[PDB]
Amino acid sequence: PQITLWQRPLVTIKIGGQLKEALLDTGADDTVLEEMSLPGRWKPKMIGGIGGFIKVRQYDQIPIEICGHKAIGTVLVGPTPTNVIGRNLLTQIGCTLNF
Amino acid sequence: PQITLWQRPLVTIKIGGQLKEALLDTGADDTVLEEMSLPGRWKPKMIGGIGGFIKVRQYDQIPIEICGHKAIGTVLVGPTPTNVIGRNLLTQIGCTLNF
Numbered sequence: 001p002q003i004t005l006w007q008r009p010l011v012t013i014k015i016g017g018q019l020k021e022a023l024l025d026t027g028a029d030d031t032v033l034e035e036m037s038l039p040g041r042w043k044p045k046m047i048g049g050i051g052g053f054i055k056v057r058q059y060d061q062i063p064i065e066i067c068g069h070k071a072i073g074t075v076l077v078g079p080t081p082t083n084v085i086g087r088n089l090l091t092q093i094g095c096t097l098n099f
Numbered sequence: 100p101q102i103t104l105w106q107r108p109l110v111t112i113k114i115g116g117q118l119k120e121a122l123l124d125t126g127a128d129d130t131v132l133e134e135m136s137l138p139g140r141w142k143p144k145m146i147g148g149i150g151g152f153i154k155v156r157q158y159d160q161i162p163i164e165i166c167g168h169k170a171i172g173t174v175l176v177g178p179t180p181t182n183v184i185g186r187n188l189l190t191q192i193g194c195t196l197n198f
């Protein structure tokens with residue numbers, strides 16, 4: 001699809017058996033989601049944005065589906081004010097900026 | 100151009116006669132630059148991100164070139180970790196997300 005930027009680019013993702021809304025975010029290196037359970041190993045991480053840092057749990061090799069597009073990657077979970085899909089997953093679905 | 104997302108989508112911008120690097124950021128509503136001087140009067144704004152809020156100075160109707168594409172619009176100045184070009188100016192240069 002071609003996604004306009006007149007509005008926030010929100011999409012539905014499927015992750016950990018759940019459906020969530022998230023922002024397609026080219027300024028985010030990593031995908032960050034609000035608190036949720038995910039299976040498997042994790043390690044603590046600090047990530048920083050406007051306003052400073054938050055502590056998150058880093059889960060690797062997590063399956064996700066975005067717009068019918070399956071991918072796998074790292075998902076950071078913690079107290080983000082909004083769910084973001086970052087570049088680590090945007091690449092996998094073949095997402096580009098065009099102008 | 101078509102910009103993939105394997106690396107950060109950093110571009111050169113020109114503002115007030117000077118070149119800077121900035122991140123094309125579809126997750127940002129607004130454009131926020133590190134401390135600098137701009138002309139005219141400014142208004143207050145608070146903007147929120149991953150780690151909380153920062154206070155910025157809002158300047159309106161500022162000419163800015165982004166990858167050579169001319170825009171004129173609102174620029175926020177404050178203690179952002181990186182220069183970000185948000186949707187207010189991405190729409191002026193005709194930018195979309197595609198996959």
Ligand SMILES: C/N=c1/[nH]c2ccc(S(=O)(=O)N(CC(C)C)C[C@@H](O)[C@H](Cc3ccccc3)NC(=O)O[C@H]3CO[C@H]4OC[C@H](OCCOC)[C@H]43)cc2o1
Pocket residue numbers: 023025026027028029030031032047048049050082084086122124125126127128129130131145146147148149180181183185
């Ligand atoms: C009301 N109007 C406005 N306008 C406006 C404009 C902007 C912002 S915003 O910046 O808060 N932000 C909003 C979004 C999170 C919803 C935009 C987002 O794309 C930031 C941009 C950014 C990029 C670099 C550093 C800080 C911020 N990305 C980000 O947080 O990424 C995190 C997760 O991955 C990592 O990769 C980059 C970061 O740091 C990794 C390297 O060490 C730092 C880490 C809110 C605004 O509100």
Ligand SMILES: [Cl-]
Pocket residue numbers: 072073074088089
């Ligand atoms: Cl990854």
Ligand SMILES: [Cl-]
Pocket residue numbers: 094103
């Ligand atoms: Cl590619």
Ligand SMILES: [Cl-]
Pocket residue numbers: 171172173187188
């Ligand atoms: Cl504007």
